[PDB]
Structures are given as C-alpha cells and as structure tokens.
C-alpha cells in the first residue's frame, strides 16, 4: 500500500497554533520528501513547504515566519505546525509525496472563536409513495453543527448509487447539510434504508432509518 493519512484539529481559535501529523505508509521517509500545500476555499492549491529525505526543509516565503515542518524518519511521520493562525488561514491542508504523487485525505481547518455544536440528524420520508413502481426518494437533514467537517452515508456505504449529498450551507453561523437517495419503489418498504451521519469534532455518530409517515 502507499498512502499519507493525516490528522489534526478541524477548529482553531485566532492566534492559536495548528499541528497536523502526516503518517505516511508504503514508502520511505529517508527516500522521499513530503510536501505541505493547503487549499483556501475558492482560491486553490497554495504551496506551504517541504521536508526532504535529508531532513532539510524549504518554505514558502509568505509562511516561513510561522511554519515548522519536522518529521520522524523511523515513525514514518512528518510534522506540520503553523503559528499565529488568523481566520483567513482556514483551508484544507494536504500532505503530498514529493515523488510518486500520493496525497493525503486532507485536514480542514476552521479558524474562529465559536462552538463545536453537535448536529441534529432528522430523516426525510415521502408522505405518499409513488404507486408507479419507478422510484422513491428519501432524504436526511443535518442541522445545527459548527466545524464543517461531517461525514454522511446510506446503509453504511452499501447504498452508493443514487446518493446526492449537498454541501452544507451556513446561515446564522451554523451549518446544515442534506443528502438524498432514490431507490426503486420496491426497495424502501422491503430494504431497510438508513442514513448514518457523524460530525468529527463532537464525536457524534448517528443513524437515522427513513421510515414511512402519513398526515
């Protein structure tokens, strides 16, 4: 295998430091440099720095003053740590192999002095189903949460096709995410559809099985 799995805080308060640990696997840190680039929402891939196999680093002038990339050859881990984080340093941070391009899952950083609110997962079921044996569409709603990173799925990945997860929208400083699923008419009553959600920040794992209703 070959993959750079990363870990770090999704929320940070202004000025507070940020530290992300990239745990590479599948190759050697004594043979490959690890790049740290981030992605400001809308903006794009900005390069922040690198630590070469010889432990020697090269930084982006714009960040040098507050960046500290270190690593542990044997532990197979690079260490990114930036200081004095301001609200505009909110982005998705990456860890990408120097050579054979392998990137990391990404680690999103929100920089605000605000709550970590746990989401409310409410199912969405069709009041009256479609008699025509074509399709039936269910949904899931995730309101009231803060650090944007939140995962959602249907029947725990088993239900993949027909899934549409819409990016969360922010109103009065809170996020609301929503996902849909469109099984055939036959599936919903027989097959058990469930929307599994989880806001990594408050450690909230939830399961909402879409059930029939009537008004």
């Amino acid at each position: 295998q070959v993959k750079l799995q990363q870990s770090g805080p999704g929320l940070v308060q202004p000025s507070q430091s940020l530290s992300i640990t990239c745990t590479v696997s599948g190759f050697s840190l004594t043979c490959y440099g690890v790049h740290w680039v981030r992605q400001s929402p809308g903006k794009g891939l900005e390069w922040l720095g690198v630590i070469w196999s010889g432990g020697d680093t090269d930084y982006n002038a714009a960040f040098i003053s507050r960046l500290s990339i270190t690593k542990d050859n044997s532990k197979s881990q690079v260490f990114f740590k930036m200081n004095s984080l301001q609200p505009n340093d909110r982005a998705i941070y990456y860890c990408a192999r120097r050579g054979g391009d392998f990137w990391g899952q990404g680690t999103t950083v929100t920089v605000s002095s605000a709550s970590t609110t746990a989401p409310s997962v409410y199912p969405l079921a069709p009041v009256s189903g479609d008699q025509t044996n074509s399709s039936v569409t269910l949904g899931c709603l995730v309101k009231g949460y803060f650090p944007e990173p939140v995962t959602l799925t249907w029947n725990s990945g088993s239900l993949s096709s027909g899934v549409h997860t819409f990016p969360a929208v922010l109103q009065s400083d809170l996020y609301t995410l929503s996902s849909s699923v469109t099984v055939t008419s036959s599936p919903w009553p027989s097959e058990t559809i469930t929307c599994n959600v989880a806001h990594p920040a408050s450690s909230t794992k939830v399961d909402k099985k879409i059930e029939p209703r009537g008004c």
Binding site: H35, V37, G44, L45, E46, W47, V50, D58, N60, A61, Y94, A96, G100, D101, W103, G104, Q105, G106, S120, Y122, P123, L124, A125, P126, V127, S128, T137, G139, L141, K143, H164, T165, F166, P167, A168, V169, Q171, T176, S178, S180, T182, R213, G214, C215
Partner: protein, 219 residues
Amino acid sequence: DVVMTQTPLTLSVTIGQPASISCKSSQSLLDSDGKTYLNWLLQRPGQSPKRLIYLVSKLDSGVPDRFTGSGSGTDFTLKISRVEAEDLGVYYCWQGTHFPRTFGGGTKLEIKRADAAPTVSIFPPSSEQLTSGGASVVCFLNNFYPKDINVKWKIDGSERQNGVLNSWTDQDSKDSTYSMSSTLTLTKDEYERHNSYTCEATHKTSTSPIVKSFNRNEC
C-alpha cells in the same frame, strides 16, 4: 517567483470531444540537470488531487492513455483525446524546477450533455424536528443538466423568499447532471399555522415551472 498561468479558465466539452489546456510559466522549466519539471494534476469534486502526468509527457500508472503531455521551457499543453464522464474536475499544473514550487490557477472542465429537467421531491418537517423550536420543509430538485435553475417557495399561495437556503451539488461524474436542494424553515407554530407548501422550479426544459407541493390536511 514562477508565475504559472493556465489559460482556459473554464471549459465545457461534449463527451468524446478533444480538450486541450495550456500552462505557461514566467521562467523556463528546463533545469541544469537537463530535465524539465512540469506535472499535470486533477482534482475531482470531493476527492484529493491526483497527478496524471509528470515530466511534461510521462504518464502515471493507471492514468488512462487518453492524456497527452507536451511542451517545453515555458509553454506546456495537456490534451485529452476524447473526454469521458469521469474527466470532470479542475486541472492544475505545477513546476518543480524553481523553489516556491508554484501551481497553475486551475481549469474547470464542465461536461456538456443534453438538457435534463429536475426530478423534484418535497419533504415535510419530521415530527422529531417539530419537537424543537422550528420546522424545515426541504425540496430536492435533482438530476437537471443546466446548473442554472431557480426554486421559489409558496405558503398558501403567498410566495416565500425568506428563510430559504439553497445548495448545489456540482457536476456528477456519472450521468453528468446537476442537483440542488432548497429548505424553507419556519417556527414550529408558524408551520402548522398553514396548509399547502409549494416548491416550484423553473428550468429551461419547459415554459411553465415544475411544481411539487403538499397539504397538511391529506397525505
């Protein structure tokens, strides 16, 4: 620094039709060691970037051979012979000869397919949510092609334009269409204080809007 400029900013193209994207640097990318360091990446929605080409023309493993890398010095060009539904995403170009290891700004690739009307679905506030201070009526207008659409709510005929939050999906790697969801949200009482809730989407496929609604008096 090395200013990388990708010219086509956005680019719509029919599946099967050729697509070239150009990347130009403000400095030659040929290094003293004799090599030119330029690699083309691809970042599909959601996922992480993937490098498709490296060393201007070499292809990465698994990277389909429909991609052609070419260029020299400051002028490089990417070329997809026939674009497929899975080519969607933004393409970037980076240089590894000079140190700030700069990146091109990106080139959005939008796949042109025929028009498609939304498959609108309406959802009433689930009792569990009702037990709280509010109620949210959600409308799913999905699978329409041209991204542009507009949903207008109505409560007992009187259109609602406040307390609504829309959200688009961004082109689907399969079926290449778009999607959106609109959620009108009221106060629990202000909700059951009415009867019919209307979600209606005006798309280019028709001259009259697509209307989906429900009545609290009947399922």
